Structure 1
């Protein structure tokens, strides 16, 4: 689990979005595994605006943050899960690291702020759904 809170927006994994997230839907992209809902309380997170390829992510299944090198956001095939069919996920970044399903929503951060959230894993890789292209999150 995990979300990003910026302005009046809550960013979550689309597959973990709650009934209240869907009741307050602003934007969703199935191909990206993202959903943004509206919040009443102001959020304090800053979104990174950069092309960093190094950062730190929170891994709940290890109660640890790991530093990682990650690929630029791209269209990658993701094996079917208990939340998705075997499909092509867009705006996805991969690193070598530990990820289990429950690690989804872990934040990946660089010096500029939030880069993305854990979205995929397995085979010793962790996949992060990029948010740095969603400029509207900061207006």
Structure 2
């Protein structure tokens, strides 16, 4: 589990979105595993605006933050998980690292801020749903 809180926005994995998230929907995209809902309170996370390929992610299943290299956001074929079939996921970045289903929502961060959240795992790879292209999170 985990979210990003920027401005009046809450960013979560679409497959973990709550009723309250859907009842306050701003934007969602199944192909990215993302959903954004509106918040009453201001959040304090900063979204990275960059093309970094190194950062640190939180892995809840090891109680650890791991420094990783990660790939460019791309359309990647992902094996079946407990929450999606095998499919193409868009705007996904991979690193070599541990990722359980419960690790979804863990933050990947670089020097510029939050890059994205854990979305995929297996075969010794962790996949992150990029948010750096969602420039509208910075405004309105």
Q: TM-score, normalised by structure 1?
A: 0.99
Q: What do the CA deviations read for 1:34-64 (whole angstroms, capped 9, x no partner)? A: 0000000001000000000000000000000
Larger displacement relative to structure 2 (76-85 or 31-40): 76-85
Give the deviation of 1:85 after TM superposition. Answer: 1.5
1:137 and 2:129 correspond: no
Question: Alignment RMSD, CA only?
Answer: 0.6
Distance 2:79 2:23 in 1: 29
Give the deviation of 1:69 after TM superposition. Answer: 0.2
Give the deviation of 1:91 after TM superposition. Answer: 0.2
Unaligned runs of 5+ in 2: none
1:113 maps to: 113
Q: Which portions of structure 1, spanning 4 or more consecutive aligned residues, are displaced by more than 3 angstroms?
A: none
Q: What do the CA deviations read for 1:11-48 (whole angstroms, capped 9, x no partner)? A: 00000001110111100000000000000000100000
1:123 and 2:123 correspond: yes
> What is the SS of the residue equivalent to 1:114?
strand
